[PDB]
């Protein structure tokens, strides 16, 4: 929107408490000027700050390069001063077509006589007819006698230099706070049902991912079991509720007659389904290469769970 | 008022190495990104080398790559220029410089801007 | 990498006015460019930065004389009443991908 204040009367706001889109300002195509000092504008929703101040003004293209730390000017000196270590960027832009006006624009003010120079983020408002001289004014304007303030003739035939210009600059203050304001955060798609590598706001860790049965209170934001372990998170989007399974592992065993009479053999995978992986799902874990069969027999190699294999005819 | 004041080369063989630096007052140097352009006994500007305020994310012109290393110390507002391997073609006046950050449409990320020069220092490279 | 073409050589009278011409490579064109100033047995000194759409932001303290303007792949510096001073060698650079490039350089030579 911009609509940037006067000069004399900068307009400070304050952005605290707040997701700062820095993306709508980066990139848009709008702005002529777009200095940063002390950050970098293409890392700028990376760096959290304390208080973001965006001062509001207007001025002339000449006097750009006056709004920068360490710079001298009529405005930059009796109007508009910036600190020596400013922190923070000046988005400016040519507003001719906005707050120009045919006969002049001259509401918008600088001052080019004042007694000393702004300090860093001032803002003086006094009106009191400047007294050059020794002989008092008293409301008369005349010789020693000048308005501290002066017009600017703002007008659409005015050239580029002449244009008014919006100025707003970020101050980025760091302060022994939180820092409330940074930009937008990433987010991906949930994915259920397989292993994947999570970070759940500030819980991270690896695992299977599948609807809970539990009912968690309004305010609790992670499961933890008896050993410290967490077993369930709430979706920080959509208020889901998903129980966490770490993911299947274990032994791997082969069963097998010696190869003094056979080569062939049968592979375990204990406590794993076979939908992870002749196959037999039992209660020891996923058997594949055996063939199961209703005869019963002694027991001849042990694979627990009471299913025994043999080799036979 | 800004001052970038230069520290100084000098005469040395080709194939040895030299620290220049480029000392910063009056302004708050660790915000700005920061250069080294050169000047060869009559020949044009040429740009050598520019860091980061932070992040050291460093560029180089490709006839010192490898060769040169740009580096800066924020505590002691300090800029520094490591040549090595010198070449008589390194012969020049070496000017630092200072300039903002923009974000540029046409290229997508950050240009580093040049807006104040220093005063010199001559580096004589000769057998 | 972008290349910026400047004319070797100009020159004008004194109190005459002279247009430095600075195109850059048809490849990368409207990107912005900055112009800098180099007297006799000095160093340089920054100028002015200049978009595509004709816009400026001059240093501070450089005089009204100096304006630039914006056309197609074509940058201009102009220097309105010229002055002894003027003389110098005028370098237009602009950016690359974090790199910057400089011209060749324009000798401006006054005449008067």
């Known amino acids: 929107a911009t609509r940037f204040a006067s000069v004399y009367a900068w307009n400070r706001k304050r952005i605290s408490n707040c997701v700062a889109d820095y993306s709508v300002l980066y990139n848009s195509a709008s702005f002529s000027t777009f200095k940063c000092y002390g950050v970098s504008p293409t890392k700028l929703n990376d760096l959290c700050f304390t208080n973001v101040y965006a001062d509001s003004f207007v001025i002339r293209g000449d006097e750009v390069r006056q709004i920068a730390p360490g710079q001298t000017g009529k405005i930059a000196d009796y109007n508009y001063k910036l600190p020596d270590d400013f922190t923070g960027c000046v988005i400016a832009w040519n507003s001719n077509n906005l707050d120009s006006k045919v006969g002049g624009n001259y509401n918008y003010l600088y001052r080019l006589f004042r007694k000393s120079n702004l300090k860093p983020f001032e803002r003086d408002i006094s009106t009191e007819i400047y007294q050059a001289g020794s002989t008092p004014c008293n409301g008369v304007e005349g010789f020693n006698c000048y308005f501290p303030l002066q017009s600017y003739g703002f007008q659409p035939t005015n050239g580029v230099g002449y244009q008014p210009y919006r100025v707003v600059v970020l101050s980025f203050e760091l302060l022994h706070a939180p820092a409330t304001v940074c930009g937008p955060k990433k987010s991906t798609n949930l994915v259920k049902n397989k292993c994947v590598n999570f970070n759940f706001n500030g819980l991270t860790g690896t695992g299977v991912l599948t609807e809970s049965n539990k009912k968690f209170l309004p305010f609790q934001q992670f499961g933890r079991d008896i050993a410290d372990t967490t077993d369930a998170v709430r979706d920080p989007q959509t208020l889901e509720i998903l129980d966490i399974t770490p993911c299947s592992f274990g032994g791997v065993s082969v069963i097998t007659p010696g190869t003094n009479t056979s080569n062939q053999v049968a592979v375990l995978y204990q406590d794993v389904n076979c939908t992870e992986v002749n196959v037999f799902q039992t209660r020891a874990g996923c058997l594949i290469g055996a063939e199961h069969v209703n005869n019963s027999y002694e027991c001849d190699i042990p694979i627990g769970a009471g299913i025994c294999a043999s080799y036979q005819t | 008022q800004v001052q970038l004041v230069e520290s100084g080369g000098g005469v040395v063989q080709p194939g040895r190495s030299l620290r220049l630096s480029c000392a910063a007052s009056?302004?708050?140097?660790?915000?700005?990104?920061m250069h080294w352009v050169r000047q060869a006994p009559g020949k044009g500007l040429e740009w050598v080398a520019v860091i980061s305020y932070d992040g050291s994310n460093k560029y180089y012109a490709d006839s010192v790559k490898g060769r040169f290393t740009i580096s800066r110390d924020n505590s002691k507002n300090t800029l520094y220029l490591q040549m090595n391997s010198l070449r008589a073609e390194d012969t020049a006046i070496y000017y630092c410089?200072?300039?903002?950050?923009?974000?540029?449409?046409?290229?997508?990320?950050?240009?580093?801007?040049?807006?104040?020069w220093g005063q010199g220092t001559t580096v004589t490279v000769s057998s | 990498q972008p290349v910026l073409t400047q004319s070797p050589s100009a020159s004008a009278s004194l109190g005459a006015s002279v247009k430095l011409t600075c195109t850059l490579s048809?490849?990368?064109?409207?990107?912005?460019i900055a112009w800098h100033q180099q007297q006799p047995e000095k160093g340089p000194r920054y100028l002015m930065k200049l978009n595509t759409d004709g816009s400026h932001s001059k240093g501070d303290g450089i005089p009204d004389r100096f304006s630039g303007s914006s056309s197609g792949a074509e940058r201009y510096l102009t220097i309105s009443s010229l002055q002894s001073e003027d003389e110098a060698d005028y370098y237009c650079?602009?950016?690359?991908?974090?790199?910057?490039?400089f011209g060749g350089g324009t000798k401006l030579t006054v005449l008067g």
């Open positions: 410089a200072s300039g903002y950050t923009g974000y540029d449409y046409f290229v997508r990320g950050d240009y580093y801007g040049l807006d104040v």
């Open positions: 009056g302004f708050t140097f660790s915000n700005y990104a």
């Open positions: 650079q602009t950016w690359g991908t974090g790199i910057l490039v």
């Open positions: 048809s490849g990368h064109s409207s990107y912005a």
